[PDB]
Ligand binder design. Structure first.
Ligand SMILES: *[C@@H]1O[C@H](CO)[C@@H](O[C@@H]2O[C@H](CO)[C@@H](O)[C@H](O)[C@H]2NC(C)=O)[C@H](O)[C@H]1NC(C)=O
Ligand SMILES: *[C@@H]1O[C@H](CO)[C@@H](O)[C@H](O)[C@H]1NC(C)=O
Ligand SMILES: *[C@@H]1O[C@H](CO)[C@@H](O)[C@H](O)[C@H]1NC(C)=O
Ligand SMILES: *[C@@H]1O[C@H](CO)[C@@H](O)[C@H](O)[C@H]1NC(C)=O
Length: 153
């Protein structure tokens, strides 16, 4: 009934929600841009981030699990599903004054979902949690069997 979660290492994680699998990475680089890419204001805006209808519930579940407040928190950014390059849904957790409180909350959520998670975000620098759906070109090689066989799925 809940999505299944896997931790590969401190930067690479996976979620399985029904038939869909998602690559979740913690990193210090983003190629998304507010007012160019899509701002995810409400849960149903996730439909503009993902080509599969049955994927939105799982991403929403994960957002709630991390502590995202849909009404009040900074909107997630995502790449529009009309782009062939593939899904890229992003939480900005930077240790910088504008996103500081939010990032702390989201890292606490990561810690609660993956007890082995340690904080890799540097003070005054950018830091992100980024999700790509397996099977989109934006997942590159990382949903191959040589990766996923390390997860329980
Ligand atoms: C993620 O959040 C960080 C922190 O708010 C953003 O970086 C800041 O952007 C503002 C607005 O342009 C700058 O004035 C600050 O100097 C930046 N701070 C740092 C530490 O870089 C960053 O742009 C956000 N990322 C995305 C993709 O929107
Ligand atoms: C986790 O594994 C990926 C894929 O092999 C690798 O690229 C990445 O650097 C690893 N992360 C850490 C923190 O070792
Ligand atoms: C996504 O891109 C299409 C064009 O490719 C555009 O018509 C649509 O408004 C975009 N959606 C969002 C939410 O920006
Ligand atoms: C999503 O589907 C639309 C329409 O079929 C297409 O333009 C786009 O390339 C697809 N995106 C991905 C990431 O598969």
């Amino acid at each position: 009934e809940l999505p299944s979660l896997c931790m590969l290492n401190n930067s690479f994680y996976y979620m399985k929600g029904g038939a869909n699998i998602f690559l979740i990475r913690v990193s210090d680089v983003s190629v998304l841009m507010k007012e160019y890419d899509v701002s995810v204001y409400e849960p149903e805006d996730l439909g503009n981030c993902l080509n599969k209808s049955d994927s939105s519930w799982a991403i929403h579940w994960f957002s709630i699990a991390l502590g995202h407040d849909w009404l009040m928190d900074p909107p997630m950014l995502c790449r529009n599903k009309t782009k062939k390059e593939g899904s890229n849904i992003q939480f900005n957790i930077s240790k910088a004054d504008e996103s500081r409180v939010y990032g702390k909350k989201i890292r606490n959520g990561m810690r609660h979902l993956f007890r082995g998670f340690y904080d890799p975000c540097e003070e005054g620098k950018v830091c992100y949690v980024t999700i790509n759906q397996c099977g989109d070109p934006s997942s590159f090689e990382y949903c191959g069997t040589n990766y996923l066989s390390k997860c329980q799925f």
